[PDB]
Amino acid sequence: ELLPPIAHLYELPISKEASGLVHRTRQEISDLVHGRDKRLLVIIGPCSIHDPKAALEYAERLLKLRKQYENELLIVMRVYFAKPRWKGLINDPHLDGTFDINFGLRQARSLLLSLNNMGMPASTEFLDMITPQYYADLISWGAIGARTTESQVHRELASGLSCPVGFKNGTDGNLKIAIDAIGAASHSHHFLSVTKAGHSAIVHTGGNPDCHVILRGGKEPNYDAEHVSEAAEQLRAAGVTDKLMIDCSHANSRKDYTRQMEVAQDIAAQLEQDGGNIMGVMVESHLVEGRQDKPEVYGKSITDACIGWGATEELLALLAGANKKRMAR
Amino acid sequence: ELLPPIAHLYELPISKEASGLVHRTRQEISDLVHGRDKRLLVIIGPCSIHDPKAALEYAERLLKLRKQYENELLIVMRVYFAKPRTTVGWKGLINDPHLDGTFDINFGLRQARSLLLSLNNMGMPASTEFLDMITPQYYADLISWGAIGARTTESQVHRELASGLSCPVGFKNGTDGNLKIAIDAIGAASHSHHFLSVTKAGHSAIVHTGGNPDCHVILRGGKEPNYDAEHVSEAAEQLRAAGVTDKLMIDCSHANSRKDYTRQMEVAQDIAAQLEQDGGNIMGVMVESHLVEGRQDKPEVYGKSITDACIGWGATEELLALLAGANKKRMAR
Amino acid sequence: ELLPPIAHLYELPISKEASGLVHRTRQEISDLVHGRDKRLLVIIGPCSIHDPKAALEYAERLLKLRKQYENELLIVMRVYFAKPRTTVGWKGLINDPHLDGTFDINFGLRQARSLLLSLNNMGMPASTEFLDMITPQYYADLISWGAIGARTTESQVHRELASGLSCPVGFKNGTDGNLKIAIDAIGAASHSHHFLSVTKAGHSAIVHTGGNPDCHVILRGGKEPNYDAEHVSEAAEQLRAAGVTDKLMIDCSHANSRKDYTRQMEVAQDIAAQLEQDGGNIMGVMVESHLVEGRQDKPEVYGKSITDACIGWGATEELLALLAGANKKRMAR
Amino acid sequence: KELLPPIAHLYELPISKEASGLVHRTRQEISDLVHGRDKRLLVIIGPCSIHDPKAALEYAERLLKLRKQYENELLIVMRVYFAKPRTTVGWKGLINDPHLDGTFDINFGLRQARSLLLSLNNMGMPASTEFLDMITPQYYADLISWGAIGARTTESQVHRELASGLSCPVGFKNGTDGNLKIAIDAIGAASHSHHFLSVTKAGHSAIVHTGGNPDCHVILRGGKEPNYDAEHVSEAAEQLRAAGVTDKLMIDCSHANSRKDYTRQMEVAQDIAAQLEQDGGNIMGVMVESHLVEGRQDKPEVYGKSITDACIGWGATEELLALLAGANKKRMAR
Ligand SMILES: [Mn+2]
Ligand SMILES: [Mn+2]
Ligand SMILES: [Mn+2]
Ligand SMILES: [Mn+2]
């Protein structure tokens, strides 16, 4: 029997400091989206969380670099619960085909609260129409994924979220559908949704003004300067923000997780050469590099493969050093 | 504030005859998807419904042709309520039934259910696009075939939605022409799913679906059209490769028509030719048709579409004879 | 599957006139309760409603008397559905509207709202007894006066209920003549309460009520009757002592009539006599009345109670003329 | 405000294997006493109202030793009453206002209620309560082994309906002025099937079809005069037989049978003891208002002392419990 959001919000209410972090981080991000601050948002963390222990451990380390680089970068953890394909730690938290959604949603809120409490903001992918209410309050940045950027109900969903939202270009490279997504997400909508209490209702939303585009490759990779400058023109054409995010992983690195660093080197070049239209990057990253089918090694992905801790330090310093130079000019 | 499904199911319960017409039409379609019957499913009617009255006059006309071509074609009306916009605009009758930015969703939901009931009661089965996660509980019982649009075919929740529907479901290929996503949608929709949904009583719940065995593909065009025998033949091999039904539907409108209503006949004509040489992979087609041809920004003229432009009634009578005769021959073999 | 109140409200919303009649009848009763108007509230009508048709006819007749005597009396119809049993039996038109043990509650409630709306539209305000905690929401907007019966006057949850009702409320003395429990009840109902209740949408919620200032006591006999002037005077003294309105209602039926429907006229004769004398603490009366007199175990004769025995329509004209005239005199002084 | 449904508390505080076994077993043992199949004496005993779990848990440990020591003469069950009926107004109890300060934090209160009950059952002490609200019972009824319908609600159809659908035995009190018929009638109604509106474990209103509660009985709790003595019991037993219902009954030592004097509960007890020695075949149980510390107070200043009706203290409780055990050992011999 499905518990409503209110049951989880009661056991695990947001603390003052988690509340303050989220509010502050959401704003700080807004500033990057509309070009009021020249720091670089870095959404970095695992492809997917399957072990809360590990995620917290990962946070601790990320925390040191988050504060270390705070004048140049704005580091925020990837806390994605799954990959649209095990459909997650939400849909199946025991990793054994048991589908215990009540436990999953509880565990997800708990991890989210714990990270916000220790100073680490959290981002995630909003896939379902109903699950967001259970932890959206703990989320500082949200992704609508390549497979739903074109869906009306997902643009609706984003139009009512209190955090900035990144729309990915379509699976085969289509950029218009993300630009459209911003236009749709920015305006008011009326639609059916589910309340904190678990009842259906008509919601009226006010529009999300802090949406932006995410370049994640396609038929070919769209991360370089020319690809970025073409994106910027199109965004200016449609009267939406020409500041965008580049996903280092997935279809931009193709089938090689270690190529994340090359893309990052290339973004670093742009930032030292000009890079005016870049406000963020995304990186798939974990304690231990690579992937595995079943979860036997601690802190190594069971979905898409991720760079390991060593390379993450490397990749962050690379970008930190690069963006310091852009902020100077 | 929102009325639950059960409220509409109490005012507008399904009749003995609607129920059988639906059970019957669904089964009849499954057989088309599984090649047990080689009639041609013809999903035909307006782009979107803005006026129940005109849709009831339309249906009465189209029913005469349903009875007349029943050995050759299986005709089912297009009764589209929810509309996917590219950016924005009127999202359909459910979302905004007074056409004036009021968003009287309870009224809209009642109107749609009543129209669909009236249609089954007169003997015209109905088809719609399932776009929202929640609205289907209000009138799925009246639906003989549903579609998942080009824009939502890649979505996991729409796939799960399909997997719990009792009617056959057609997935369209994506807006650029990508066909893999719809092949993948059949894969997923055919399996059992656990996900979150809403009950008849208006509450969120866990639902464990049995999976929908009667799903199929719809070719509706992309960067360039995809209706001809060659494109049909490439798709067919891909379907057999993935080990799912190689029977598919071809849409004559949208990207296959280059968004022009005077090309829909052209497409139907290439389909008739295919049907006459062979075309054993074609189990159905789709056509945007209204009492009157074209479109209009505002609902001024009766029976004229305010969304995509449609062919008129005269042009519809032709298109149907065209396919009726072309398919009789195929069935003769 | 129980439909929420919003479903019934959507189908039978209140009309401008029904709303005005309720609003204004409620205020007129408040006046009578707080001694600002010396007309006599008369709560008259069948013991229980088992036939809406016969109900609507009774109103028509009663409507002509409501206006004739509008200057002396304020006539409001007894439209009780929900009936408390000593043990068990037919609990009412809500709980079992088909009279056959089918317990079709959704239909019952729809029928109850429908009758109430009609009665109001044609100009006859309605009164009822609130027994259940959940069913009030379905039609309380159509109710001008409410009763908490003798068996629940001492119940804390019914006192809480009463604290949130927007219409005046009569508490009866307890089944063996205890009056204190009713005086207490007004104490409770007059205050703010916090408790669990159910919303217009069918969900449990915490409600906070502001208190009902228009409560009063009803004298309905015990082991011995309590209608006469001495008991009336004895009651007023008790009221004034606990700091509540000393304006009360007297039941002419039940333990005051010794469960004999003929004795209802005896009691009204005594009230009439008190009104001619002085009787300044009487603000209303109750009468169990129907088109046809007496009772039956099964609904065979039209307009004849199947519960407690009522006076016929003949005896009604007589009892109203009698009270109308006696109170015209009191009003003169 | 935002009431959590029973499923929320049921999920945080699921009934345990042991609690569940104790509830099933006590409910059955009680049914036996109601229907003249066992001669032990059911003893409902504990504070008038719970205003502090800690004290309630300390109380229970003590009473557990005596439940055990007297298990072959008495069946002991703690009074864990949350909801209270005021004559007019007042604190309605720990559920309705758990911080004691006018805050009506009912979500906290229900979680507190469930936690206490669960802990009580987990430690081997079954629990009884009065069911006053239509909606609260769903939050912890599963942890209750015996229930009470109060004197002020025994004549109410919806409290009879409620009772008809409880899985535990129920005792209906006689009316505040001594009316016994209303309670005999109430067993009548409660033993039959009803259809009525209630609220689900998930928080929605629903139609419920109840099966009937066959283990209802009467409680003599006084009226204008007390009704505990032999003469009153036998006259009650005749009225019960007359109406076709069980002539086994419970006698409340407190409230109108002790005329609101906590020191007379022992006198009542003594009278009951005699009747168990003389014959007493219609008695199946007793109720006592007991606490760690005797008397009462308007504010929860002293620990283990009632803020509602006055209770006898631990000492008098040890005394009263031995007296009854002794006297019932003898009745069980015959
Ligand atoms: Mn990934
Ligand atoms: Mn269209
Ligand atoms: Mn009556
Ligand atoms: Mn007490």
Phi, psi dihedrals of residue A273, rounded to the nearest 5° = -85, -45
| Residue C37 CB contacts under 8 Å (≥ 6 apart), including other chains | C28, C31
| Residue D59 CB contacts under 8 Å (≥ 6 apart), including other chains | D46, D47, D78, D291, D292, D304
Pairing of strands C282-288, C248-251: parallel
Classify residue D14 by its DSSP letter: P
Q: Which of C316, C268, C266, C308 is nearest to C291 (CA)?
A: C316
- Per the structure block, which two tokens stand in for D175? 């009316």
> How far apart, in whole angstroms, are the C-alpha atoms of residue C42 and residue C47?
14
Q: Which residues of A touch B103 (CB under 8 A)?
A: 190, 202, 204
Known binder of ligand: residue D151? Answer: yes
Ligand 3 mean position, distance from CA C104 (Å): 23
Neighbors of chain C with 3 or more C-beta pairs under 8 Å: A, B, D
Say which of C88, C133, C156 has its CB closest to residue D188.
Answer: C88
CB B80 within 8 A of CB B91: no
Q: How many other CB atoms are there within 10 angstroms of residue B19's CB atom?
A: 14
Method of elucidation = X-ray
Classify residue A132 by its DSSP letter: G
> How far apart, in whole angstroms, are the C-alpha atoms of residue B205 and residue C66?
53
Q: How many other CB atoms are there within 10 angstroms of residue A85's CB atom?
A: 9
Q: How many other CB atoms are there within 10 angstroms of residue A97's CB atom?
A: 8
For testing contact with chain A, the best of C6, C203, C204, C206 (most A CBs within 10 A): C203
Q: Is B207 on the interface with A (CB under 8 A)?
A: no
- Return the C-alpha torsion angle B76, B79, B84, B90, nearest 10: 160
CB D148 within 8 A of CB D170: yes
Coil, helix or strand for D293?
strand
Q: Which of B146, B194, B118, B150 is nearest to B43 (CA)?
A: B146
| Domains with residue ranges and CATH for chain A | 1-329 (3.20.20.70)
- Of the listed ligands, the closest to the CA of A286 is 1
- CA D275 to chain CA centroid, nearest Å: 22
Say which of B1, B10, B200 has its CB closest to residue C6.
Answer: B1
E strands, chain A, are 40-45, 73-78, 122-125, 141-144, 165-168, 189-194, 200-205, 211-217, 244-251, 278-284
Neighbors of chain D with 3 or more C-beta pairs under 8 Å: A, B, C
Element (H, E) at C220: none
> How far apart, in whole angstroms, are the C-alpha atoms of residue C275 and residue B177?
90
Element (H, E) at B21: helix B16-33
Breaks in chain B (C to N > 2.5 A) come right after none
- Return the C-alpha torsion angle C318, C323, C324, C328, nearest 10: 150
Q: How many other CB atoms are there within 10 angstroms of residue A324's CB atom?
A: 17
Cβ pair A130:B4 closer than 8 A: no
Q: Which of A218, A206, A139, A210 is nearest to A177 (CA)?
A: A218
Q: Which of A258, A296, A261, A298 is nearest to A58 (CA)?
A: A298
Say which of A4, A152, A199 has its CB closest to residue B84.
Answer: A152
CB A89 within 8 A of CB A107: yes
Classify residue B2 by its DSSP letter: P
Q: Which residues of C touch A197 (CB under 8 A)?
A: 203
CB B315 within 8 A of CB B265: yes
Q: Is D207 on the interface with B (CB under 8 A)?
A: no
Whose tokens are 């159509």? That residue is C142
- Of the listed ligands, the closest to the CA of A285 is 1
For testing contact with chain C, the best of B9, B10, B11, B104 (most C CBs within 10 A): B10
Q: How many other CB atoms are there within 10 angstroms of residue B208's CB atom?
A: 10
Amino acid identity of C173? N
For testing contact with chain D, the best of B10, B199, B203 (most D CBs within 10 A): B203
Listing DSSP states for D158-193 in one string gives: HHHHHHHT-SS-EEEEPPTT---HHHHHHHHHHHS-
Known binder of ligand: residue B254? Answer: yes
Pairing of strands C143-148, B40-45: unpaired
Phi, psi dihedrals of residue B73, rounded to the nearest 5° = -115, 155
Neighbors of chain A with 3 or more C-beta pairs under 8 Å: B, C, D
> How far apart, in whole angstroms, are the C-alpha atoms of residue A31 and residue A28?
5
- Per the structure block, which two tokens stand in for D12? 């945080």
Q: Which residue numbers of C belong to the known binding site for phosphoenolpyruvate?
A: 78, 83, 150-151, 172, 220
Ligand 1 mean position, distance from CA B130 (Å): 29
- Per the structure block, which two tokens stand in for C266? 């005896």
Q: Which of A181, A244, A185 is nearest to A215 (CA)?
A: A244
Known binder of ligand: residue B259? Answer: no
Ligand 1 mean position, distance from CA A257 (Å): 10
Coil, helix or strand for D271?
helix
Q: Is A195 on the interface with D (CB under 8 A)?
A: no
End-to-end CA distance of chain A: 58
CB C181 within 8 A of CB C158: no
Cβ pair C203:D204 closer than 8 A: yes
Q: Which of B43, B255, B239, B21 is nearest to B147 (CA)?
A: B43
Total number of residues shown for chain A: 329
Say which of C1, C157, C178 has its CB closest to residue D134.
Answer: C157
> How far apart, in whole angstroms, are the C-alpha atoms of residue A172 and residue C279?
90
CA B144 vs CA A255, B6, B29, B78, D123: distances in Å? 43, 20, 8, 11, 59
- Per the structure block, which two tokens stand in for D197? 């509106």
Q: Which of A177, A179, A204, A178 is nearest to A190 (CA)?
A: A204
**Helix %, strand %, coil % for chain C, to 5?**
40, 20, 40
- CA C325 to chain CA centroid, nearest Å: 23
How many contacts, defined by CB atoms under 8 Å, are there between B and D? 3
Amino acid identity of D34? V
Resolution, given in Å to one decimal, reads: 2.5
> How far apart, in whole angstroms, are the C-alpha atoms of residue A115 and residue B303?
58
Q: Which of B254, A109, D104 is nearest to C193 (CA)?
A: D104
Element (H, E) at C295: none
Cβ pair D207:C105 closer than 8 A: yes
| Residue B205 CB contacts under 8 Å (≥ 6 apart), including other chains | A1, A2, B196, B197, B198, B199
Q: Which of A194, A99, A107, A181 is nearest to A144 (CA)?
A: A181
CB-based burial of residue C211 (10 Å sphere; 0-12 exposed, 13-18 middle, 19+ buried)? Answer: middle
Beta bridge partners of A191: A203
Cβ pair A199:B204 closer than 8 A: yes
CA B203 vs CA C112, C199, C270, D139: distances in Å? 27, 15, 57, 20
Q: Is D87 on the interface with C (CB under 8 A)?
A: yes
Question: What does the buried/exposed string (b/e) look like for C104-113 if buried means 16 or more CB atoms within 10 Å of the residue's CB?
Answer: bbbebbbbbb
> How far apart, in whole angstroms, are the C-alpha atoms of residue D270 and residue D276?
10
